[PDB]
Structure 1
Amino acid sequence: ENPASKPTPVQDVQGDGRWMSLHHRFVADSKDKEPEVVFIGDSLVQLMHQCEIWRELFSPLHALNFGIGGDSTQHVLWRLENGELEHIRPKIVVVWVGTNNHGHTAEQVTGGIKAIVQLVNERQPQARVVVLGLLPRGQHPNPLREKNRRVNELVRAALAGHPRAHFLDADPGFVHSDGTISHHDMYDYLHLSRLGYTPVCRALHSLLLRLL
């Protein structure tokens, strides 16, 4: 198996059960609500709900945010299989995950993203899927930039022939000419500041509006 595409929950090694609490909250959300758009992924998804305004762009679209910080592809795959797509019939599912897949190759991460798209295509066949590219990270040039770029190439190639599957590069050019990423854009060179989120969210929002 590709570990990136074998669905598995996060194991609690801390003791407070937070990841399963989040999953259960989302399951309840889907049971009780009727979203047009559901967003799922890692902290870049989750903190959009706080740290960008979410309220002005995405709230109007009738959206649920199932981001969880730290998730890898296989965790998002498990969550979609285990309740978060039940009781709903979204028009669009937005996926943003793979930057946390440490120890997986770029090809394995791509297989995890492809597996997520396929599950959504099975469980929610009416939905369009939007996959976001993995953003650059690290203050300076480093292997995860190359990795992330290579996933993006491979995912873009995989989705090119997919009528209702859409790859979106949301990066406005966070890596400057000198190789650096500004902490004004990503405060810790991974996570977006409010300023970082603006261009990202703008780009997503445009696409969503087109599709919708």
Structure 2
Amino acid sequence: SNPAAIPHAAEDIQGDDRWMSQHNRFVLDCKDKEPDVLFVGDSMVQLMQQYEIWRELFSPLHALNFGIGGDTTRHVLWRLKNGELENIKPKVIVVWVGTNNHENTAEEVAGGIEAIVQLINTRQPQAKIIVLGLLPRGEKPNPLRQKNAKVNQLLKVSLPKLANVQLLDTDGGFVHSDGAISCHDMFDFLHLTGGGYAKICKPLHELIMQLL
């Protein structure tokens, strides 16, 4: 039984209950909003809205962003089953999660993303889903690059399957020949800078325009 495929809320261990506050807000947005494009996932998704690129490329598409920093496949699943997929009928749904699934094997993470896709076209069978490939991370070669690459390969094979879904695995010149990632693409060797998002968003935006 895949643990990454089982919905589970991110329990508050700090005390400021920020996770639920974000979730509730997304539920609140689902009430007085009607988007055509829905963005769901982790910090890779959330942080995208904090860059100018979002207003120029995605704001015009009437898009909602339900990204939460630190979320794993389990967390995303829970949110999707608990209201974040109600009162709305998006034509396109962008999913980007898995890089925070520490302790889970690549196979488990792939399985969890699949569980997400399955839940999405169950609740939103009319929506076309776009799953973003997990990006390399770490300044130098390390286990997570391998782990993340295996997830993308596994998804590439499992996603042509399932309904209305496809894997977009765009990759800039992130990992150079010397095996290093520049802080100019990822400032902390994980999250993207504006230059880094430029390499990913443009292709993502054309596929969305297409699907729509």
Shorter-chain TM-score tier? over 0.9
**Which secondary structure state, in structure 1, belongs to the residue aligned with residue 40 of structure 2?**
strand
Q: State the 4+ residue runs in structure 1 displaced beyond 6 angstroms.
A: none
The answer to whether the Cα contact below 8 Å between 1:90 and 1:127 also exists between their aligned partners in 2 is yes
Per the alignment, residue 64 of structure 1 pairs with 64
Whole-Å Cα distance in 2 between the matches of residues 67 and 140 of structure 1? Answer: 27
The answer to whether the Cα contact below 8 Å between 2:121 and 2:163 also exists between their aligned partners in 1 is no
Whole-Å Cα distance in 1 between the matches of residues 117 and 197 of structure 2? Answer: 24
- The one-letter code matched in structure 1 to 2:105 is T
Whole-Å Cα distance in 2 between the matches of residues 162 and 20 of structure 1? Answer: 30
The answer to whether the Cα contact below 8 Å between 1:52 and 1:197 also exists between their aligned partners in 2 is no
**Which TM-score applies when normalising by structure 1?**
0.98
Per the alignment, residue 50 of structure 2 pairs with 50
Per the alignment, residue 175 of structure 1 pairs with 175
Q: Deviations over 1:2-38 (max 9, x none)?
A: 1101100100000000000000000000111000010
Per the alignment, residue 84 of structure 2 pairs with 84
The root-mean-square deviation of aligned C-alpha atoms, in Å, is 0.9
Per the alignment, residue 129 of structure 2 pairs with 129
**Which secondary structure state, in structure 1, belongs to the residue aligned with residue 93 of structure 2?**
strand
The answer to whether the Cα contact below 8 Å between 2:40 and 2:65 also exists between their aligned partners in 1 is yes
Per the alignment, residue 3 of structure 2 pairs with 3
The answer to whether the Cα contact below 8 Å between 2:118 and 2:162 also exists between their aligned partners in 1 is no
Per the alignment, residue 35 of structure 1 pairs with 35
- The one-letter code matched in structure 1 to 2:36 is E
**Which secondary structure state, in structure 2, belongs to the residue aligned with residue 201 of structure 1?**
helix
**Which TM-score applies when normalising by structure 2?**
0.98
Whole-Å Cα distance in 1 between the matches of residues 210 and 91 of structure 2? Answer: 12
Per the alignment, residue 207 of structure 1 pairs with 207
The answer to whether the Cα contact below 8 Å between 1:52 and 1:198 also exists between their aligned partners in 2 is no
Whole-Å Cα distance in 2 between the matches of residues 166 and 119 of structure 1? Answer: 15
Of stretches 163-172 and 146-155 in structure 1, the one that deviates more from structure 2 is: 163-172
Whole-Å Cα distance in 1 between the matches of residues 163 and 32 of structure 2? Answer: 30
**Which secondary structure state, in structure 2, belongs to the residue aligned with residue 12 of structure 1?**
coil
The answer to whether the Cα contact below 8 Å between 2:39 and 2:64 also exists between their aligned partners in 1 is yes
Tell me how far 1:163 sits from its aligned partner.
Answer: 5.1
Of stretches 52-61 and 20-29 in structure 1, the one that deviates more from structure 2 is: 52-61
- The one-letter code matched in structure 1 to 2:100 is N
Per the alignment, residue 74 of structure 1 pairs with 74
Whole-Å Cα distance in 2 between the matches of residues 6 and 152 of structure 1? Answer: 20
Q: How many residues align?
A: 212
Q: Deviations over 1:89-131 (max 9, x none)?
A: 0001100000000000000000100000000010000000100
Per the alignment, residue 19 of structure 1 pairs with 19
Structure 1 residue runs of 5 or longer lacking an equivalent are: none
Whole-Å Cα distance in 2 between the matches of residues 23 and 153 of structure 1? Answer: 30
**Which secondary structure state, in structure 1, belongs to the residue aligned with residue 166 of structure 2?**
strand
- The one-letter code matched in structure 1 to 2:61 is L
Whole-Å Cα distance in 1 between the matches of residues 52 and 115 of structure 2? Answer: 28
Identity %: 66
Per the alignment, residue 140 of structure 2 pairs with 140
Whole-Å Cα distance in 2 between the matches of residues 161 and 111 of structure 1? Answer: 13
Q: Deviations over 1:51-106 (max 9, x none)?
A: 25200000111100000000000100000000100000000110000000000000
Whole-Å Cα distance in 2 between the matches of residues 134 and 52 of structure 1? Answer: 22
